[PDB]
Symmetry: C2
Subunit: 413 residues, 2 copies
Amino acid sequence: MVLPNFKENLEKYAKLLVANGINVQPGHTLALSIDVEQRELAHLIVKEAYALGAHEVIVQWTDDVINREKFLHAPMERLDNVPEYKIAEMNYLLENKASRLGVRSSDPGALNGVDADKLSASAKAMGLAMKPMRIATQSNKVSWTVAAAAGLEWAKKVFPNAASDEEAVDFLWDQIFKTCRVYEADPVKAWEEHAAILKSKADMLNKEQFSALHYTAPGTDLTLGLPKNHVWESAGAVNAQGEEFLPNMPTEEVFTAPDFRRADGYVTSTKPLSYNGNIIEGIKVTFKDGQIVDITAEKGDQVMKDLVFENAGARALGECALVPDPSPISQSGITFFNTLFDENASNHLAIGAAYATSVVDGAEMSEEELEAAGLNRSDVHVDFMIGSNQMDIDGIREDGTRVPLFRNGNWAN
Amino acid sequence: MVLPNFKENLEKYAKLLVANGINVQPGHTLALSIDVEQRELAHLIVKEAYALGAHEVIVQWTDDVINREKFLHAPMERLDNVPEYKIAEMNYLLENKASRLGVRSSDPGALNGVDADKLSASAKAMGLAMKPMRIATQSNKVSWTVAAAAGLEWAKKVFPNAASDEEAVDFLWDQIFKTCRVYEADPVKAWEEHAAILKSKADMLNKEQFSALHYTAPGTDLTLGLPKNHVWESAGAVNAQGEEFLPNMPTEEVFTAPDFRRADGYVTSTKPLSYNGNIIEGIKVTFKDGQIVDITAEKGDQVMKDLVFENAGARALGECALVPDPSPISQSGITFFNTLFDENASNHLAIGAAYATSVVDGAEMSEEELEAAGLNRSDVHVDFMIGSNQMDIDGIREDGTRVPLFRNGNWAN
Ligand SMILES: [Zn+2]
Ligand SMILES: [Zn+2]
Ligand SMILES: [Zn+2]
Ligand SMILES: [Zn+2]
């Protein structure tokens, strides 16, 4: 009743993810990563990928229940290293220049109750093992896309007051479809014009080349430097083959990397965060000389401290992203407990790695150059959100001039 | 409605699969193959495996719709070889001595309009690539179990007289639960009673040590030599580590290997066969001096020839199994289009590999020794059903005496 024409819209969504998200070309290999619960969507994705000429789709199926049992019951020795066959699966994808479509539908609290040290050692072992792919991906060597599907446990958390499970799920798909423009009569046109409006804010920032940004809101007073020759990006990338693609659907942000060596001040998080299958609440961070010097959370405090102080590069920032508080996901009043959505509802920062493309010619830079360019290197990249309708930001020019950028959570003018 | 207490019985089934099918032990690795459509059962299986002390469950998810798309649309070079990463995965299972629980719920006609040459090439290359696994399982190096779950497309073919798709699946679940003794107050004891009965029979044929078997029925007059020191087996097996396990659930057969060098005459199949995701009908096979000299089918003729002429050892048999016509599955009158079910409703023969345990001490024999002893070495093993209410079978003794074994499809004297 809340979601009429479901099957048709779902097929319309699948088509979008494949034609416009990844942009499948003849001869391509597609890796789809997706939850078993979402087989219906997976079938539609795979059909469309072959209809557009893919030579091969490989589906890597995930499942929260089974992943939780592994974490809960396997010994550390199965959890703290990556077996060779998984590395060999990754290399086959790399070898084939596989596009990577990731459809997220997991329970935000999927791994609640798992020992802290196993989540942490598994994420470290994987972050190190999967690095070649992250590197290839963070530099648009292949098309990649992150998108969502309405998992049942996720939907119950997003809408705890739903009249029933089905209603919770309908409401989530409805948000997915609306933010991905699936209801538009011409979604491609609509995506093109959404893209244009963000691209023009990004161009305006690329021209200013601010030296730093200063954020202010209650619980927040933070100054972040920006690298020399940084690129603000949004909605739309071009891969190392001339092909256009959408890295995130939905998306409402314009973003770049700060200079990882320059951060002072403090910041209060305004959204929860799902990290390692746990929900983290009430995060606060203090920065000094470019480094995290204290990190705290009302729930999940130990998860954050372990993120930050036990992975290299994680005491520094790799992304700063702007989203107007009046934009549609922020305005829906929904908290998603999910990074792809909540990050497109609110300004956000990332702990850990900078995308290579956040600096000019960054996609052909070595790790050494990227680092010297002021772009943080890390095996983790963990977005947390800091915007609100009370937030002001100024851009700071090279001569210290303060330019209003955001006022009360929206572009200043 | 036609099915009592689904959730509880499904749970009881999964425990049964893990405890008595595979017999999971502390420290074991388990590999589960299961369709994504059966996630509810998979969650139950995985939970009990860890409850029983597994160190790791690795789930190999399978999906008919996506496999068909691949076969319909991928080019030959993605279908006629097995990527190194699948072989790495298999080797990781072998090195860890993984148990193998295969839950089948596949559509019998899953791959219906796929090019025959693609089916044949993909099966041949898999048969070659998976050889070290086939070998280890057929000589009980690890526990393994093949069992079933009620897939929708399968259930529709099985019960076209069903009021609905949902009721079709229900009737299939009811057969699965029925024949695996899930409805009994003590299924373990029911399974021990069942195994004890079939073991009586196999023990008695093992005393006989017939020289050959002679089958007669309307499309069948086939004589098959039996190896020196053959062993007739049924129900339970025992693995290299001393643990009891059940290879097949359900099961109703007693079986051994014929001598692959001794076969003469012709035989007609009596149930359809699902092979390479195609339904095969009206198979006739002609043997001369141990070898298939011609194989036809009214439907799927080419698929059968490709099986027999393209794979190593596929011109000889490696199994002959007996199941009385009045036995429960056969008596139900239902045609499953499914080997695990149909072969346990009817005498059958397997094209390809003999189990090492079909000759005394075969578990300990080199491949060379197995072949010297008269057990067929092959990269495939494919059962087809030949039994009916009119089949006669004589045992031939070493002094030339014909001893009735079956008359009109049943054990007889
Ligand atoms: Zn971002
Ligand atoms: Zn980010
Ligand atoms: Zn058999
Ligand atoms: Zn067999």
